[PDB]
């Protein structure tokens, strides 16, 4: 209740805060193309049958199939800007009490002075009495003028040096790097992704990014990992759900043609819905892109 003191009024603290940026960046499409091998067939209209409400029917017909005969394959393109330009912003927080799993009870009503005295600095703020255990559809909120909560997801990068790594290159969980894909071999990602032997996969001028988080099962990302329940009770793409996580080796891993073969679709992250940013209900397998995967 003092830590956020020096969150709340005049001593900018012993801690601090930040931003990044989330939006809607729509992308249309042009490309080159050469001669005749895409083969195109033409045909007729086949069946079943059934009846209904008032209606019976022609949705029957004319089925296709197709061919992947490829030594290599074929399509290349250089490109154009955005259209007239779509981008809008602005500021506050994220969620960690909608959903359950914890343990009981020998102090309450004053941290009851802490979402009745916590949830600060922006639109709309929460509740009093605390029932249990649900999927949780509630009250009324707002419809659209600027920012579906266009909002953060904190990382942080303690502290210090001279003038080129936040003055030249750089990014959020640490180093211009690369776990080594397909090469020497694929059962070393505990001392190339977990333990240690040498100097820096980029910036060996000094050893990793910020003095206190650079291995296995730790805290500020204890915000993050995902077997036991926080892909189970409050659903999140979460700030990141592939920045510290399971990625790939058991099918087709041979440096080059899967240099044509892995950055894709999984059950995933952040697309066009409305108002603050959910995760799983039923209902929508679309296939947005995500430049910036691995």
């Amino acid at each position: 209740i003092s830590l956020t003191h020096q969150l709340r009024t005049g001593f900018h603290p012993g801690i601090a805060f930040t931003v990044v940026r989330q939006d809607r960046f729509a992308t249309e499409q042009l490309l080159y193309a050469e001669r005749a091998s895409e083969s195109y067939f033409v045909g007729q209209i086949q069946v079943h049958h059934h009846d209904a409400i008032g209606g019976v029917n022609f949705t029957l017909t004319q089925p296709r199939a197709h061919v992947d005969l490829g030594v290599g394959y074929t399509a290349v393109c250089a490109t154009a800007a955005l259209r007239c330009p779509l981008t809008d912003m602005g500021n506050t927080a994220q969620n960690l009490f909608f959903s359950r799993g914890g343990v009981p009870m020998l102090h309450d009503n004053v941290t009851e002075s802490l979402r009745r005295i916590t949830a600060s600095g922006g639109r709309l703020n929460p509740t009093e009495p605390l029932p249990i255990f649900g999927g949780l559809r509630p009250a009324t909120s707002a419809g659209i003028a600027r920012g579906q909560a266009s909002v953060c997801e904190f990382v942080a990068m303690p502290v210090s040096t001279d003038l080129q790594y936040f003055r030249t290159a750089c990014n959020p969980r640490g180093r211009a790097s690369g776990m080594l894909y397909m090469g020497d071999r694929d059962a070393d990602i505990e001392a190339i992704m977990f333990d240690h032997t040498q100097s820096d996969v980029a910036y060996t001028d000094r050893a990793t990014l910020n003095p206190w988080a650079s291995q296995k099962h730790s805290y500020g990302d204890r915000l993050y990992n995902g077997t036991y329940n926080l892909t189970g009770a409050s659903p999140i793409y979460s700030p990141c759900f592939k920045f510290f996580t399971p990625a790939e080796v058991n099918t087709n891993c041979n440096t080059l043609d899967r240099l044509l073969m892995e950055a894709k679709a999984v059950a995933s992250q952040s697309s066009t819905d409305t108002e603050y940013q959910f995760k799983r209900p039923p209902g929508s397998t679309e296939m947005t892109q995500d430049p910036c995967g691995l």
Partner: protein, 49 residues
């Protein structure tokens, strides 16, 4: 341009998963802890002196 000066991190890290001791240390149990002994940590009650 727009401000962001002085107002919010208090819906926010009064947070629960930081006091943290079951499962993390758990997931790294079983070794032999690297060269380190007391410097001094034990304690006592007087000294009958």
């Amino acid at each position: 341009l727009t401000q962001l000066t002085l107002r919010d991190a208090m819906g926010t890290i009064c947070h629960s998963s930081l006091l943290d001791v079951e499962a993390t240390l758990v997931a790294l149990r079983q070794q032999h802890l690297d060269r380190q002994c007391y410097f001094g940590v034990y304690v006592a009650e007087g000294t009958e002196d």
